[PDB]
Write a protein that binds this ligand. Structure first.
Ligand SMILES: [Mg+2]
Ligand SMILES: [Zn+2]
Ligand SMILES: [Zn+2]
Ligand SMILES: [Zn+2]
Lengths: 102, 196, 264, 49, 141, 160, 559, 65, 114, 86, 133, 49
RNA sequence: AUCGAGAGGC
């Protein structure tokens, strides 16, 4: 249940921000039935938005990163595909080692 | 293709009736999309179009050689001297309806080339054809009536979709499926089985 | 004259007619020129049986050339479609047989014009299958060239068809077509750099209509009812018959629609 | 219009493609990488003509 | 007669090439705005002059009309595709028994010709046709 | 850098600040210098960060660097995917590379490992160590031509 | 890697592709040859025995036909060479390997398969000609083009396989991709330029065209919308007619720069219940954009409604465009005399600034700014000056472009074309570069043997003040070519490096599956995450919404 | 490789005109523009059929057998 | 290799009726006619003529695929007006105008010299 | 192990039918119907086995049961009847 | 089914914008210096000069598929010169008892402000605009 | 045929990320065609005179 | 079947 509250924390922040009493009654003008309808739709859309078990999210991640890297095209730092190759292959001898000091 | 990397295939064939036409009655042999123009910046294609128009009207040659003092402005002066719009545009009427196109159209002679790639020489299809000898997999190649490769780069996508049974079929029922007998003690296919 | 559409011929020739179509809606003129292009029937070679070919061209090259040759089709209506007739392959009521045999006799190069075609089959007295010849020197279209020692022996069978099946059956070519030289209809938006007027050439048909007043507002309810056409014929059918037969073919299509409605 | 410049081996026409190499008997000087124990090198590729 | 010379890559290190013989005319304004911008050479100690700059191109590139108005990758693409266009590859095609041959029925010489086409014999063995092209949106096909 | 920070009134406002950009990395030393903020300093050498600030800092800087290589090209990939990549590189002890020398050395079966690179050597090492492949990996079943435990084959189906 | 992890397979086909504006999104144009070549095993049941007998009697040589029949005994029966190919007695439980027919599920693919959206289920439409045909709006997920690309088709062989295609790999499902949490398909070039032109406030349509468009929308209610203008002539607006494609129940609100609710330049977009109120429709509205129209209609209405939406928008806009017309020409690359003059005067002022900074560097009067050499300072300054000149001339050009300029229109719609394309084609093509620097001294202390030694002039090191319209001088030509070569090499090399990287990513994370307890694990069960994405949501149906709590004065927050 | 019968674009027969064209160039020593005009070839669709033509057949004839 | 025989552009086959007629759904007094082996030449003219009959509410045609020679014409008329009668009247008006065109043209051509 | 079941009350897996198990179930039923197996719905003019299975689903007359497996080996049996479809 | 607003306005500022057949015209009420409006007008059909005075009217009638005027029998509700049909999308509460309404006639917009039309212009899809010369 | 007869190969590598040998070099002016070269792999290695 | 070369799409 702690993990549950943690997972839903941020979306609940958005919820309370949007379903704030003075907002519901002054910014929107929701009626009773309209409010309960918003509630049911929210819960339904949430439950539908949950990820489905069985999803092979690993291949999905790999493809979702590799595809836009195939369109990675051409002012001081190694960027793009050379940088990505430096990152994945753990590159101890990187070409633009920098340090940003605040 | 044309002589400027503007390559492409034929999508449709229209008879002269359905083709758009100018008041002179002239009809395009070819129709290419304006959207292939600005992304490649192949201005020479359009200059060629303009020059070829003025040459065909003049019965002279088109000095499309590079590093010359031939300008678009002089070409246009000539073309207008021949009674056409200087930038090469022409009012054109729809072929289906015959109402003027609200847009005037760039339209003229341009050298095009027929490339060595043709569909009936690329087309292939196979369903349970010849198999290879060693792997017992489909043979490689159209000229041998083989099967396309279901590469692992595609097995990846089939996994990301989640289609387990389609993947097994592509891997067993559509290629080199086989059945062997194995011993419940030594887990190796060394069993001699008279099925008859 | 007859109440309805109005015609006024500006110029007329054996090969082309420049006229005006008044009190007509656009769709009619457009379907008329579409029919004038595709739906009107003529006669042209649709089969070739080749016996000897020592020429530098392949057989199919020559066959494609022959199909394109203009043949007389004035009386084509009295000839029937081979698909419609009852013969085995072709007859005299459905097809015309030409023959072409020439030999490279002379040391100099020997041409083969369309005039060298010989009509074998029985015409049964109709203006049909005559290779069209408008050349000043009487020769036809240059079909092939022969060296001393080459010959060519073949038999063409001309049938009846329309340009839809193949463009060889096209009775006309290059139908000029314009309406509203002044764009009073606001049917096209002129692309320009400085002045659309000075940057677009005036149409020749601007003379036959009065220019508008710059202060007069847009005549919005006016529609297009006057057309400037110029129909040119290769010669397989005279221009007058090209346009009249197109009119009648259009009418015949509408008629078939009527009859099918009745059968329903 | 034939231009020649090809051979005819067993019916098939063959072309000899120009093979590109660096010229020998010329002296070139090349720096060495940072982790190299030696600093520079002078090389000449002595070839008997 | 000493009017022309053979210069290789090494020797041209020691020379100053002019581009057009007009670069040797003296100078002592009202110009055509449409022509390209050619900088004054500002050099005088010339030893040679290019025969014609268009000669920096290969056989294939000398087919491209106005390659000075194109993104160079397009010129490269075309130089790779011009070797795939059909046409009369030889006048004796009917005699040669080649594994594959493709001949254009009615080849046309282009209406836009490079001066270098004459020495390439392209107007005598063309590989395309002057198609009437319309750039237009029409049915979206 | 024109960074944003809350005004005392509460609304965010742009407050620029001077920042130092170097041409080299020794984090353990630069960190302990006076006059700096030892809580906001940053490196593109995420491996030095794993060395100094622990493994989770490494995860965070790793994700940040991948995010930047994507967003440099104006593109955008959702958080979860880069997250999964970074976590996989970090879920082990420390930084595991996506190479034959990194991930391919784990105990993740034997047929799955041989399917990437160095195939016959993996198979020899397994035949020596008497490895027992679980046959629960994807590539194991793909090789065996069976329905792998994937979204559709992630369970059984039976009768009521 | 060549016979186990991937192999050649039966029931496959491959050929060229072209596009059909009259095909559905999930539809795929299958040539009749291939349909006669590929088979599906269908079992005989009371529901099919009539159709299956008809197909067997129809024969393998003409479609819809069948090729083989499989009895209970298990002996194959070849319909090409058999006495009894006419009098067939189909018994229940037999198998007819029927032809591929309309609305069959096929897997459609284009290599390189970088995507789940690169292998997608399609509905079969058997077509006459020899090319594969697909909807324009399905190109972007495949990265396909009609310049010679070829595509592959695989055919399922069991009912569960067809089910896995239709219910998981179908096209409308994969509209919103989990990658980038947005739609991967949108309205594209022709339809895009046309939908812009149509939805202009200046665009009115007469009755006849209106009725033809109305009928063109398939799932049309059959109710003519009340015209916008009535009195002098009953007229509709391009907006009004296009709104018939949008399903009722759709709200879309978006504000651009200076988007008053009066929107004097038709900015933004306001669409109320399948009818639009104001806003020119363009790429931002109807592209494959986050929070676009496709995002909405897929989330609210669903996948199939959005696929029909693709179809209807395309059909209406393509009709209107076909009867409207569009072209490019070179006249859309000419700026007028005064603009060209200002452009060349700008190039001259940039040349003067470069000359001045060069002379200053020559007199050793440079300030050695920390961290960089004198030469590095010099090169940075001159490159900056020339880029500023190119950009200023390009904006000088784009200002002079009129609204009728079709290049400007394609840019405005977002169909194709960018500012830099305009700048280079008409204003100035720019500075050429190799390995990040200007044209290097390949010869001894010069770039070309037409230059005096030690000439750091703008053009001597690769600056092209001439435009593609004007024409490049031979040195400019050679330098441009020198840069383009680097470009082609970088492309050809990035391709292979990305292929390797992608393969390694996939082979590393392949076994990562979200299990039933939401724990993201691998083959060994070793946990990689405890909540997928740390919130356990699918990457699709996730949208960029604002958090009104952050930001704003505490005063306004309290208020 | 030989004069096409008619223009591809419009269809006006041109095959009957080749030998005239050449003679209009050689007999009358005209230029190709006026020569094409004299033959009723006004549309440029027609004009390019003759102007861009290459009678390769004259080479093919030179091969003896 | 896959091209259809060109005669299929005008040549009906295997009981393909020229006209097929279907009542429209959710449309009072409306009907859709599927013309077979015809193109814009006919449909454009029939529709533009139906637009002149003041008792026609709706009239439009469409070619669902240029591959095929066929098209769809939907007509909605007033109550008590079988649209087939509107189609007939339009067609007959077409034919009358065409006959008058032919006669006037022949008049002008025989009047014309050369 | 030996009877590693889970009591039907203390079940924490999703009560909703995942798209993957839905597609697998529909495919299994369409397979059963491809062969002559009985159909438990009044097919209102439906022939395609897939649509028949989908309608058997909407009326929840599909007598199958999913066995969701947990990485420890524990599993939960879920009738198609109780599983929610959305 | 009758009129919901009536007034006479004097043309103040007409601007073409980047369009060629449409202008955006801002006008104010006559004899009343407190109520004003802006509106998109097709100038090709109905021209609008500066400082004109055009009678402006809004009606709610005079769902069902549109049909053209069959004959003169159709009794128009419009002896005016320029008529349009649109939808109200916003009612702007400008100030205390100062209201404004936003209309869209297929993209041609309208903004109207005042408070002598309050009791009439409801949130109705139904809306007709009429202009007498 | 001509382009094939004026082709040069540079065998220093078949597969590798070699940018320097491939790029168009200043010295190639007038001797090698700047643009005519294969696409993709072996770009800039195979040249035409 | 092995090896080699050329080409297509990114
Ligand atoms: Mg491509
Ligand atoms: Zn044993
Ligand atoms: Zn007969
Ligand atoms: Zn012509």
């Amino acid at each position: 249940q702690n993990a549950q509250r943690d997972a839903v924390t941020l979306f609940c922040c958005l919820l309370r921000s949007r379903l704030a009493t003075r907002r519901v009654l002054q910014e929107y003008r929701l009626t009773k039935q309209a409010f309960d309808w918003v509630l049911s739709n929210i819960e339904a859309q949430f439950l539908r938005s949950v990820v489905h078990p069985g999803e092979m999210v690993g291949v999905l991640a790999a493809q979702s990163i590799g595809e836009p890297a195939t369109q990675m095209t051409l002012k001081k730092v190694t960027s793009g595909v050379p940088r990505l190759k430096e990152i994945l292959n753990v590159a101890k001898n990187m070409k633009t080692p920098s340090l940003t000091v605040y | 293709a044309s002589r400027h990397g503007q390559k492409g295939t034929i999508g449709i064939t229209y008879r002269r009736e359905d083709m758009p036409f100018t008041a002179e009655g002239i009809v395009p042999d070819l129709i290419i999309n304006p959207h292939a123009i600005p992304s490649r910046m192949t201005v020479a294609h359009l200059i060629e179009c303009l020059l070829s128009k003025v040459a065909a009207l003049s019965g002279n040659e088109g000095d499309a050689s590079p590093f010359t003092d031939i300008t678009v402005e002089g070409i246009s002066k000539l073309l207008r001297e021949h009674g056409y719009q200087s930038r090469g545009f022409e009012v054109m009427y729809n072929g289906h309806t015959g109402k003027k196109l609200m847009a005037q159209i760039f339209f003229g002679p341009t050298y095009y080339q027929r490339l060595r790639h043709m569909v009936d020489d690329k087309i292939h299809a196979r369903a349970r054809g010849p198999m290879q000898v060693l792997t017992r997999q489909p043979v490689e190649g159209r000229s041998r009536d083989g099967g396309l490769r279901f590469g692992e780069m595609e097995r990846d996508c089939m996994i990301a979709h989640g289609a387990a049974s389609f993947l097994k079929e592509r891997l067993m029922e559509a290629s080199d499926a086989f059945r062997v007998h194995i011993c419940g003690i030594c887990g190796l296919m060394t069993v001699i089985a008279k099925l008859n | 004259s007859e109440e309805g559409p109005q015609v006024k011929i500006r110029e007329a020739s054996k090969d082309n007619v420049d006229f005006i179509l008044s009190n007509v809606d656009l769709a009619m003129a457009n379907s008329l020129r579409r029919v004038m292009i595709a739906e009107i029937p003529t006669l042209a070679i649709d089969s070739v049986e080749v016996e000897t070919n020592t020429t530098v061209l392949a057989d199919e090259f020559i066959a494609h050339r022959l199909g394109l040759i203009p043949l007389q089709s004035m009386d084509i209506e009295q000839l029937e479609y081979s698909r419609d007739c009852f013969c085995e392959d072709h007859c005299d009521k459905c097809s015309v047989v030409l023959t072409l045999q020439a030999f490279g006799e002379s040391e100099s190069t020997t041409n083969v014009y369309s005039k060298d075609l010989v009509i074998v089959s029985n015409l049964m007295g109709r203006n049909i299958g005559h290779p069209i010849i408008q050349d000043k020197e009487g020769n036809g279209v240059l079909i092939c060239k022969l060296r001393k020692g080459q010959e060519l022996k073949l038999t063409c069978v001309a049938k009846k068809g329309i340009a839809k099946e193949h463009a060889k059956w096209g009775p006309a070519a290059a139908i000029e077509f314009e309406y509203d030289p002044w764009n009073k209809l606001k049917h096209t938006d002129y692309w320009y750099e400085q002045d659309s007027a000075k940057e677009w050439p005036q149409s020749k048909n601007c003379e036959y209509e009065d220019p508008p007043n710059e202060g007069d507002p847009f005549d919005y309810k006016a529609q297009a009812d006057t057309f400037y056409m110029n129909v040119e014929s290769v010669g397989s059918i005279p221009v007058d018959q090209v346009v009249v037969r197109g009119i009648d073919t259009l009418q015949k299509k509408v008629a078939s629609i009527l009859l099918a409605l009745t059968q329903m | 219009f034939d231009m020649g410049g090809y051979f005819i081996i067993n019916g098939s026409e063959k072309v000899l493609i120009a093979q590109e190499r660096s010229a020998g008997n010329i002296v070139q000087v090349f720096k060495k990488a940072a982790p190299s124990p030696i600093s520079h090198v002078a090389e000449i590729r002595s070839a008997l003509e | 007669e000493g009017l022309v010379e053979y210069i290789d890559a090494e020797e041209e290190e020691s020379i100053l090439i002019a581009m057009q013989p007009e670069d040797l005319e003296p100078a002592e304004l009202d110009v055509d705005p449409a022509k390209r911008i050619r900088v004054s050479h500002h050099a005088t100690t010339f030893t040679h002059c290019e025969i014609h700059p268009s000669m920096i191109l290969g056989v294939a590139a000398s087919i491209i009309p106005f390659p000075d108005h194109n993104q160079s990758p397009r010129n490269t693409y075309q130089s790779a595709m011009g070797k795939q266009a059909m046409g009369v590859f030889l006048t004796n095609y009917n005699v040669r028994m080649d594994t594959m041959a493709n001949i254009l029925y009615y080849p046309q010489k282009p209406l836009g010709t490079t001066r270098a086409m004459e020495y390439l014999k392209f107007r005598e063995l063309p590989a395309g046709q002057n198609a009437i092209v319309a750039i237009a949106c029409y049915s979206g096909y | 850098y024109d960074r944003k920070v809350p005004s005392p009134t509460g609304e965010y406002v742009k407050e620029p600040e001077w920042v130092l950009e170097t041409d080299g990395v020794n984090l353990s030393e630069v960190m302990t210098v006076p006059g700096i903020d030892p809580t906001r300093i940053y490196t593109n050498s995420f491996i030095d960060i794993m060395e100094v600030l622990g493994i989770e800092a490494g995860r965070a800087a790793l994700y940040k660097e991948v995010y930047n290589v994507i967003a440099s090209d104006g593109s955008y990939v959702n958080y979860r995917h880069m997250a999964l990549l970074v976590d996989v590189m970090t879920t082990q002890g420390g930084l595991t590379s996506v190479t034959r020398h990194g991930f391919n050395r784990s105990n993740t079966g034997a047929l799955m490992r041989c399917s990437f690179e160095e195939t016959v050597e993996i198979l020899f090492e397994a035949g020596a160590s008497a490895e027992l492949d679980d046959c629960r990996g994807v590539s194991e079943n793909v090789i065996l031509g069976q329905m792998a435990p994937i979204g559709t084959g992630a369970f059984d189906v039976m009768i009521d | 890697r060549g016979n186990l992890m991937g192999k050649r397979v039966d029931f496959s086909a491959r050929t060229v592709i072209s596009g059909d504006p009259n095909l559905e999104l999930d539809q795929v144009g299958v040539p009749k040859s291939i349909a006669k070549t590929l088979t599906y095993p269908e079992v005989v049941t009371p529901y099919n025995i009539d159709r299956l007998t008809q197909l067997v009697r129809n024969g393998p040589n003409e479609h819809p036909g069948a090729k083989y029949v499989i009895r209970d005994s298990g002996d194959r029966i070849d319909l090409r060479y058999s006495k009894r190919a006419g009098d067939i007695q189909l018994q229940y439980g037999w198998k007819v390997e029927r032809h591929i027919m309309d609305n069959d599920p096929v897997l459609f693919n284009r290599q390189p398969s970088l995507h789940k959206m690169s292998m997608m289920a399609h509905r079969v439409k058997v077509i006459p000609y020899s090319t594969f045909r697909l909807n324009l709006s399905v190109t972007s997920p495949y990265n396909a083009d009609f310049d010679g690309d070829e595509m592959n088709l695989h055919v399922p062989q069991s009912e569960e396989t067809r089910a896995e295609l239709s219910q998981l790999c179908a096209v409308p499902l994969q509209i919103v991709s989990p990658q980038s949490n947005k739609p991967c398909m949108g309205i594209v070039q022709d339809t895009l330029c046309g939908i812009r032109k149509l939805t202009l406030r200046d665009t009115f349509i007469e009755l006849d065209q209106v009725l033809n468009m109305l009928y063109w929308v398939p799932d049309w209610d059959g109710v003519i919308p009340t015209p916008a203008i009535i009195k002098p002539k009953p007229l509709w607006s391009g907006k009004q007619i296009l709104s018939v494609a949008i399903p009722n129940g759709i709200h879309l609100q978006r504000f651009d720069e200076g988007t008053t609710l009066l929107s004097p330049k038709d900015n933004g977009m306001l669409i109320i219940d399948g009818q639009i109120i104001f806003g020119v429709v363009e790429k931002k509205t109807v592209g494959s954009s986050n929070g676009g129209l496709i995002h909405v209609v897929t989330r609210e209405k669903g996948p199939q409604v959005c696929a029909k939406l693709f179809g209807n928008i395309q059909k209406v806009v393509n009709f209107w465009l076909l009867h409207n017309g569009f072209s490019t020409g070179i006249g859309d690359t000419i700026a007028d005399g005064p603009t060209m003059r200002e452009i060349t005067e700008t190039i001259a002022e940039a040349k003067k600034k470069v000359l001045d900074v060069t002379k200053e560097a020559q007199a050793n009067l440079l300030t050695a700014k920390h961290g960089m050499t004198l030469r590095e300072s010099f090169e940075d300054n001159v490159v900056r000056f020339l880029n500023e000149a190119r950009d200023k001339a390009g904006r000088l050009a784009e200002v002079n472009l009129k609204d009728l300029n079709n290049v400007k229109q394609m840019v405005m719609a977002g169909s194709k074309g960018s500012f830099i394309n305009i700048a280079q084609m008409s204003a100035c093509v720019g500075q050429q570069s190799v390995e990040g620097k200007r044209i290097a001294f390949g010869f001894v202390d010069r770039t070309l043997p037409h230059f005096s030694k030690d000439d750091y002039s703008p053009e001597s090191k690769g600056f092209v003040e001439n435009s593609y319209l004007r024409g490049l001088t031979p040195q400019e030509f050679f330098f441009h070519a020198m840069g383009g070569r680097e470009g082609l090499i970088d492309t050809a090399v990035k391709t292979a490096e990305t292929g390797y990287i992608q393969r390694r990513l996939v082979k590393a994370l392949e076994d990562i599956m979200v299990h039933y307890d939401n724990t993201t694990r691998n083959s060994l069960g070793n946990v990689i995450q405890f909540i997928y994405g740390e919130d356990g949501m699918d990457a699709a149906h996730i949208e960029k919404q604002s958090l009104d709590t952050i930001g704003g004065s505490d005063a306004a927050f309290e208020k | 490789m030989i004069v096409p019968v008619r223009c591809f674009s419009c269809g006006k027969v041109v095959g009957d005109k080749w030998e005239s064209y050449l003679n209009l160039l050689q007999e009358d020593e005209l230029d190709e523009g006026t020569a094409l005009s004299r033959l009723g070839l006004k549309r440029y669709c027609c004009r390019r059929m003759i102007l861009t033509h290459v009678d390769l057949i004259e080479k093919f004839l030179r091969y003896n057998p | 290799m896959n091209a259809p025989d060109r005669f299929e552009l005008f040549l009906l086959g295997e009981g393909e009726s020229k006209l097929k007629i279907d009542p429209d759904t959710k449309a009072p007094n409306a009907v859709v006619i599927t013309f077979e082996k015809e193109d814009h030449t006919l449909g454009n003219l029939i529709r533009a003529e139906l637009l002149n009959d003041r008792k026609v509410l709706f009239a439009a045609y469409k070619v669902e695929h240029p591959f095929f020679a066929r098209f769809k014409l939907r007509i909605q008329t007033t109550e008590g007006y079988d649209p087939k009668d509107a189609l007939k009247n339009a067609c007959n008006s077409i034919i009358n105008k065409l006959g008058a065109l032919k006669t006037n043209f022949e008049t002008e051509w025989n009047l014309q010299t050369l | 192990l030996k009877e590693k079941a889970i009591p039907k009350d203390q079940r924490a897996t999703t009560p909703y039918m995942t798209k993957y198990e839905r597609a697998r179930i529909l495919g299994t039923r369409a397979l059963q119907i491809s062969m002559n197996a009985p159909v438990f719905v009044d097919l209102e003019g439906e022939t395609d086995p897939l649509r028949i299975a989908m309608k058997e689903l909407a009326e929840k007359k599909i007598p199958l049961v999913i066995r969701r497996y947990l990485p420890d080996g524990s599993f939960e049996d879920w009738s198609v009847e109780e599983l929610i479809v959305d | 089914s009758n009129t919901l607003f009536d007034d006479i306005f004097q043309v103040s500022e007409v601007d073409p914008g980047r369009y060629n057949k449409v202008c955006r015209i801002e006008a104010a009420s006559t004899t009343q210096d407190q109520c004003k409006l802006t509106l998109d007008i097709n100038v090709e059909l109905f021209p609008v000069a500066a400082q004109d005075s055009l009678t402006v009217t809004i009606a709610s009638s005079l769902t069902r598929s549109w049909r053209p005027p069959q004959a003169g029998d159709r009794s128009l509700a419009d002896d005016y010169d320029y008529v349009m049909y649109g939808t109200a999308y916003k009612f702007e509460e400008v100030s205390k008892d100062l209201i404004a309404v936003y209309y869209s006639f297929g993209g041609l917009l309208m903004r109207l402000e005042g408070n002598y039309r309050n009791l009439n212009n409801l949130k109705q899809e139904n809306a007709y605009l009429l202009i007498r010369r | 045929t001509l382009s094939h007869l004026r082709r040069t190969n540079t065998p220093i590598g078949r597969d590798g990320k070699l940018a320097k040998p491939r790029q168009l070099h200043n010295t190639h002016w007038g001797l090698v065609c700047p643009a005519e070269t294969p696409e993709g792999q072996a770009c800039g290695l195979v040249k035409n005179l």
